Write a protein that binds this ligand. Structure first.
Ligand SMILES: N[C@@H](Cc1c(O)noc1-c1nnn(Cc2ccccc2)n1)C(=O)O
Ligand SMILES: N[C@@H](CCC(=O)O)C(=O)O
Lengths: 255, 258
């Protein structure tokens, strides 16, 4: 009956509307993914329930318990029927779930507090005074972990052992750390967020250099899911009619 | 174990004739981005393959009259080719009849002009008629403008479909030659990938202006219900994550006559 949608609370994808306290159900939320979910549901003709992933994670497989967490986990163990959020299409995930073609293209990038003397990944790698890290249980950490590229390889050996920990549990925590570390902390995140934050007060962060790779976000469903193929056609249609660019301009519409 | 028939297309730097092709046989006649990818794909998946240039030299579209598919898409649809490894754009009409792996390259529609031409964006193009402009036939780009309800693009399509002489070209090479020979009176709408490649080729007289009109990607394609599909998709994502696809792009794109 009601499709259970798992998504994550990350502006401008999903955020609490003002005065949400007296609101109920899906009306409590607004954002890029909120509108996209509505679109998908409208064209596919089904009711749905937005639910914030319990642990607030994107999705990774515990190196020990070998159990998947985050939104990926919700789909794998059957808690959600579909994930509609900025979930990165990767090999280890495609091995356990299905993704539609990307509804957004992006790449890993570098966020620094304005004034920080670093222009690129090469810059970060050769020094240590300026610390840097990424999010836990995400596609960025994994990217560096599996990279054999000298540049990105060096960076990993540095992060994997840095103390105190350069890793963060949430993205909002990685941004907050840059803003508060007087230039001693650079953050590695996806271009999408780096751009969003650069146009926000106190307008003290910025993206430097080009992206380190080219990937995309896809709508995810349990492996061999029935809704899968239909959702993919729906998404390609929305993109081709220019609605997805419209949504992007709307939510990425200080500094 | 059977030799996999791979349909591809002659579009530099994806698939090009090697300098000594006249005295060479089969796959050794070609070189390029896609030739290298086909090799990488074939290696990991463990199978032998035969590169075959698509007979009509087209990408793929369904005929408005006969309703028959042509190009590489046609090769897959009618069972002539087992797989397509080329810069084939992932699109709705195609996904309806064939399968695509996830993108091995990202791009968007762009504007190529003869340097010095007074045009900076699609909006500029649509607001005048002194400078003609068109696109490639039987491809995703022409279909984009035909189905766009966006003011600018809609207006651009209204002009193009009725222009005289025709503003459409059969191959990308033809589009580039027209830009170069028309003294600035013709602008060509094509995918950023090809536009940036040409910008680095002699006589270095063309250039991309404005930003992409959309965002999409190229994907390896297989017939619907193909056992190769899923496996090749994972193989491509792997190559992508290891950076092999970016190194491959550098090689054939920037490793540059300008
Ligand atoms: N998407 C990654 C997570 C992930 C990761 O590993 N490193 O960085 C991110 C990331 N950064 N931003 N976003 C999403 C975003 C939020 C708000 C505005 C713009 C974009 N995700 C994953 O699926 O693991
Ligand atoms: N990539 C396009 C061809 C080039 C173009 O249409 O500009 C296709 O697959 O049809």
């Amino acid at each position: 009956k009601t499709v259970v949608v798992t998504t994550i609370l990350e502006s401008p994808y999903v955020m609490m509307k003002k005065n949400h306290e007296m609101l109920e159900g899906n009306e409590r939320y607004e954002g890029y993914c909120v509108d996209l979910a509505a679109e998908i549901a409208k064209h596919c003709g089904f009711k749905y329930k937005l639910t914030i992933v319990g642990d607030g994670k994107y999705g990774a497989r515990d190196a020990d318990t070998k159990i998947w967490n985050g939104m990926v986990g919700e789909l794998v163990y059957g808690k959600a029927d579909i994930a509609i959020a900025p979930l990165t299409i990767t090999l280890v995930r495609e091995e356990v779930i299905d993704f539609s073609k990307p509804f957004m293209s992006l790449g890993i990038s570098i966020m620094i507090k304005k004034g920080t003397p670093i222009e690129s990944a090469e810059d970060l790698s050769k020094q240590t005074e300026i610390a840097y890290g990424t999010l836990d249980s995400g596609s960025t950490k994994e990217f560096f972990r599996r990279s054999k590229i000298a540049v990105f390889d060096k960076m990993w050996t540095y992060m994997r052992s840095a103390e105190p920990s350069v890793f963060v549990r949430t993205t909002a925590e990685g941004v907050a750390r840059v803003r508060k570390s007087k230039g001693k902390y650079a953050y590695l995140l996806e271009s999408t967020m780096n751009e969003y934050i650069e146009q926000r007060k106190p307008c003290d962060t910025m993206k430097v250099g080009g992206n380190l790779d080219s990937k995309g976000y896809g709508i995810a469903t349990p492996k061999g899911s029935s809704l899968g193929n239909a959702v993919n056609l729906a998404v390609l249609k929305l993109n081709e009619q220019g609605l997805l660019d419209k949504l992007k301009n709307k939510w990425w519409y200080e500094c």
